[PDB]
Symmetry: C2
Subunit: 359 residues, 2 copies
C-alpha cells in the first residue's frame, strides 16, 4: 500500500491517507485528477502523471523541520488541499505540512493540564465592526477564583489573522508545557487581528504610503479597545509590570509601534523575525527619545527580545542587537538554528520568550 517509512501528515483530515511524511523528511503527495491538464503543489512545482488518473509528487530533497503552508494548484488555480485541515496564512485559508523534529516535544500534547483557547467577541468603534480575539487562559484559571493574571498580547504577521498563533503556532501546547514544567508564569495570552491579511497599494499611493497604512490602526485598537475588553472580562493584573507584547514579521513592527509609544503600559517587548527597525544613528531621538536615557529605558523595559531564524539572514537582527548593547540598551538575542521565515521559528521564539516574562 503506502511507501515504506511514511506516516500521514499530521494536518490531514480524518480518513485522508495522503499527503504522507517520510522518515527522510520527504513529502509524498497524491491526488486523483484525471481531467486536469496540470497539477502543482505550491513551492514544489509540477506533479507527475500516473496510471488510473492519479498524480504524484515526492520532495526532491529532504524538507526542513517544522510547519509549511501549501496549496494544491489545479491548472493554475490555487486551493486548499481537500485532504487537509485549514490554516489561515498567505491571506486566505490554506493547508499545512508538518515535518517532525527528533527529540522535541515542547509543542506536543502531553499529559499535563491544558488551558482553554477561547473565542471572545467585542465591538470596535475605531473600525465600526464586531471583532473576535483568541484568548489562552491557563489550566489553573477557574480553580483560582480570586487570582489575577498577567497578560501577553501576541500578534501574527502579514497574511495571517487572529487564529494563526493557536492553530499553526501550537501556542496553547507551548504555554501548557512551559507552565506545567515551572518554566513560565501562569498567564493569559490574547491573540487579535492586525488587519494585515492582504497588502494593497492604492492608485495614488507610493510604496511608503501603503506600508505606513498597513495595520496602522492596530496600536489604537489594542490600547483603546482590546485591553479594556480583556480587563473587563478576565481576571487580569493591569499595571505595566504585568503587560507584555510580542509580534512576528509585520506584527513585530506593530509591536514596536504599540509598545515604544506606550511604555507606561508595556514593560516587555518581543520581535520575532520582526519588521520593526531601530535607526542606531538616531538612537537618542527615535520613538520620541525613549532610548536616550539608557538606565531609564533599561529600568522600564525588563525584556527587549529579538528573535530570528539562522536561515533568514540573522546578521541584520544580530547587528541591531549588538549595536543596541554597544550603546547601552539591554537586549535578549535569540537565533533559531536551521529555520527561516516560517512558524517553527516563532514557536521556538515563544518558547524562549514566555519564560522571561513577569519576574
Amino acid at each position: 500500500d503506502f511507501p515504506a517509512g511514511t506516516t500521514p501528515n499530521e494536518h490531514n483530515i480524518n480518513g485522508a491517507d495522503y499527503p504522507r511524511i517520510g522518515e527522510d523528511r520527504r513529502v509524498h503527495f497524491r491526488i486523483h485528477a484525471p481531467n486536469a491538464q496540470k497539477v502543482e503543489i505550491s513551492f514544489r512545482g509540477e506533479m507527475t502523471k500516473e496510471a488510473d488518473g492519479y498524480w504524484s509528487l515526492v520532495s526532491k530533497e529532504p524538507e526542513v523541520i517544522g510547519f509549511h503552508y501549501y496549496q494544491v494548484i489545479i491548472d493554475g488555480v490555487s486551493a486548499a488541499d481537500p485532504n487537509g485541515k485549514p490554516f489561515f496564512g498567505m491571506g486566505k485559508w490554506v493547508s499545512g505540512i508538518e515535518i517532525p523534529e527528533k527529540g522535541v516535544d515542547y509543542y506536543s500534547i502531553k499529559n499535563v493540564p491544558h488551558g482553554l483557547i477561547s473565542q471572545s467577541w467585542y465591538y470596535s468603534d475605531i473600525r465600526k465592526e464586531w471583532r473576535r480575539c483568541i484568548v489562552y487562559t491557563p489550566a489553573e484559571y477557574d480553580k483560582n477564583p480570586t487570582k489575577k493574571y498577567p497578560v501577553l498580547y501576541l500578534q501574527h504577521g502579514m497574511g495571517e489573522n487572529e487564529t494563526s498563533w493557536a492553530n499553526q503556532g501550537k501556542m496553547n501546547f507551548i504555554m501548557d508545557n512551559l507552565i506545567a514544567e515551572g518554566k513560565a508564569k501562569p498567564m493569559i495570552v490574547v491573540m487579535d487581528n492586525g488587519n494585515i491579511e492582504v497588502f494593497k497599494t492604492n492608485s495614488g499611493e507610493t510604496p511608503e504610503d501603503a506600508r505606513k497604512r498597513f495595520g496602522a490602526e492596530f496600536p489604537a485598537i489594542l490600547v483603546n479597545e482590546i485591553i479594556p475588553h480583556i480587563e473587563s472580562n478576565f481576571r487580569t493584573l493591569t499595571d505595566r509590570d504585568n503587560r507584555a507584547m510580542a509580534g512576528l514579521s509585520w506584527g513585530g513592527l506593530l509591536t514596536f509601534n504599540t509598545t515604544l509609544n506606550n511604555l507606561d503600559k508595556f514593560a516587555y517587548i518581543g520581535g520575532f523575525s520582526g519588521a520593526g527597525s531601530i535607526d542606531l544613528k538616531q538612537l537618542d531621538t527615535v520613538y520620541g527619545g525613549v532610548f536616550k536615557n539608557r538606565k531609564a529605558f533599561n529600568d522600564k523595559v525588563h525584556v527587549f527580545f529579538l528573535g530570528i531564524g539562522s536561515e533568514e539572514h540573522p546578521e541584520r537582527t544580530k547587528n541591531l542587537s549588538d549595536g543596541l548593547q554597544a550603546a547601552g540598551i539591554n537586549t535578549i538575542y535569540y537565533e533559531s538554528p536551521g529555520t527561516a521565515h516560517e512558524f517553527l521559528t516563532w514557536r521556538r521564539c515563544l518558547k524562549e520568550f514566555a519564560p522571561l516574562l513577569f519576574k
Copy 2:
C-alpha cells in the same frame, strides 16, 4: 458589482465574490485563465467570461439559510479560496448564507457574549487525544461560585465538533436566548461523533457507525467536563440533542442512560422507535408511561417541512397516542440543512432546566 448584491457573509476579508442578491440568487466569480472547466457544486458549469474569469448566477432564487459548497476546477473539488472554512460533507468546504427578512436570533447583537472554548482530554476507549468545543455563558466568570446545567449537542454525519459553533451559529443563538430571558444560562458541550465518512469493510457498518460515542460521552466526556467546568451534575441538569445521525446517537445514549439524562432532542434525527413494540424497545423504558414522562421532562422531535416530515410527525403522534409526551417542531421552508437545526436549537434550548 451587480445591483442589489452584497458579499456573502462567509467570505474571507477582501473577497468581493461570491455575492448574494436581494432576490436570493448567488453570484460566483472565479479567476481561472488556464482551466478547461469550472463548476460550482450542485449548480453546474460556470460561463467563460473575458479576462479568463468564470461567472455563475443561480438560475432560480435559492433557499434561505446555509448551504455547503465547493468550487470544482476541471473536476477536482476544493474549498472556495474566497471562503471561510466549514467542516461538512466529511472535509473542510465552503458556505453560502442566504439572509432571512426580519430575523436576528442567530445574529451578533449588542448583548453579552459567551466564550466558545477548546478543551482537550484523553480517551482510553479510542486511545487518542480529543478536543471538545464548549460554550460558557456570558455571566460564567462574573459568578465564580455558580454552577451551570449542561447540554450535550451533537452534529450529523460528515460534520465534527466544530460544526455546531460555526455553520450552526449556536453561540449567538444562546447569547440571544439567554439575554432575552428565554433560556437559562447553561454550558453547551459539542464533541466529535466520529462519523465524518461512512465506509464499509453492509448494514453491519451502520451498526458500527459512531457506536462508541455513547460510552465516550458517558465515561470520558462528562467526567472531563465536570472536572473542568462549574457544572450541576444531577440528571435534571443534563440534556442531550443531536442532528441527523447525531439524533440516533442521542437516542441510544440517553434512552440507555436515563439515570443521567432528563431531556432528549432529535433534530431531523435518524433515531427510530417501533411503535408496535413500544413496550419492550430500549429495555422497556417506555412501558410505564407515567414513569417515563416524569423522568424525561422534554422529548423533542424537530424536522424540516421540506425533508418529508411525515415520518417524524407520525412518530410524535404515535408516541402521544400511546401516552408518551413529546414536543413536535416543524421548520417551515427548510430541509436537511443547517437553518432547520438552528431553528431546532432556538426552539429546544428554552425548554431545558425549568
